[PDB]
Design a protein around this nucleic acid. Sequence first.
DNA 1: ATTATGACGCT
DNA 2: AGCGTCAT
Length: 430
Amino acid sequence: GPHMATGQDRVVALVDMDCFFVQVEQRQNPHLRNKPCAVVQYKSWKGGGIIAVSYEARAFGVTRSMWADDAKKLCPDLLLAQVRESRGKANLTKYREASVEVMEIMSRFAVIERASIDEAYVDLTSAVQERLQKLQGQPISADLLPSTYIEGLPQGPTVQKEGMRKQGLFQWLDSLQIDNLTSPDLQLTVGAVIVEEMRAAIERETGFQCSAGISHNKVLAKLACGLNKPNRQTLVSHGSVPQLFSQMPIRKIRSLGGKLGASVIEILGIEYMGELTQFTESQLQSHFGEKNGSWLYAMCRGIEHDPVKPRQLPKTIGCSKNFPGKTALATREQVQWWLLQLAQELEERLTKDRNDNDRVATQLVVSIRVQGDKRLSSLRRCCALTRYDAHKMSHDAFTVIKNCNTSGIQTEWSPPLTMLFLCATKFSAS
DNA sequence: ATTATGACGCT
DNA sequence: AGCGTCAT
Ligand SMILES: Nc1nc2c(ncn2[C@H]2C[C@H](O)[C@@H](COP(=O)(O)NP(=O)(O)OP(=O)(O)O)O2)c(=O)[nH]1
Ligand SMILES: [Mg+2]
Ligand SMILES: [Mg+2]
């Protein structure tokens, strides 16, 4: 009743750049704009692997993870841009720099948490209180929400999508009590106004379009963001959760798309998020552990407490390359050469990070994969990172991994290596 | 032969 | 510390 917390204390948004790497390449090359196009890394093997797809190309069935040659079968006029190659490997610097452009604009409006190269959570609670004081009980005009969808509306008592959007928004605004400065629905609405402004600023100052979700926590904001892509934003209210979750496959919720979600489905014999409400918190904890069980009990009611961490910069800076099938490294000279290439890229990125961000990494993590292992990492070993020197870093990585070489011979490497990975971690202010 | 990252939980 | 899971 009156003591049952409803998880409506915060306003949280999730901003995700639409087909990011594609947009970066389309800004640079106008010939790619408003076309089916995709971004690929490498080229020789099956045309390269697609990692980003414009919405025009998605209409033909092109997806991430698809080989470019296969995508061309679905979409013969697909345009391709290739990721830059440096020191023998894909180099993603152009997209990281574009990411920084966007994140610095977002940070003008509120403290953000960088969740990926192209997505950030925003805690808008305080900004919303400020705007509410400025409004002075003035209603919110639909004109201030020109790209906003209200999930679940319209309902009750009509052909085109923009008309649908406007009907739902009008129903939402008509039911708003702008008198009450602590109304959660009002707070979400003002949050949506602020996100319209943030998205307008991003597009004006970078050329990039994005989608966004506005709700009371990170998981609902993330789910909301996906409901109306591209170039739109969606408000998911607390009240919309029962209907939304009643047909929502468990795997759609961030963190339940893998083994844990499969176990929820299999153990409980359910399919949809909403079905979780019928279990007690102790029941869920008994199946899935204390932490997961409490999290699921709250999440299926729309409640989640994970804070938006004030963290605009990545916590690690890493370099990795796969050596699949027959390209695997089977000589010591090979392993040393590729460790050096990875370490030279890492040195370049670390030196730029130190100059930009007043910090220094102190730990080097070396990960390898050996032929035959189905795991991402076969071995992970750390050593000290005391100088930004590529030859030192590559020598240190070789020292920590050299005992994996089964070959009695000194020149050969067996079993051959199918992945190398260097990661700088444990930053300190400098 | 998807690949290149990056975050975080467990023990 | 090293490994696994979840992303994508
Ligand atoms: N190197 C690499 N980059 C990747 C990979 N997957 C994605 N990227 C890169 C390329 C992506 O552009 C970027 C952002 O990832 P998303 O937000 O998941 N996809 P997007 O923004 O394209 O589409 P949407 O409109 O649905 O949000 O990360 C990968 O496996 N490897
Ligand atoms: Mg995106
Ligand atoms: Mg993203």
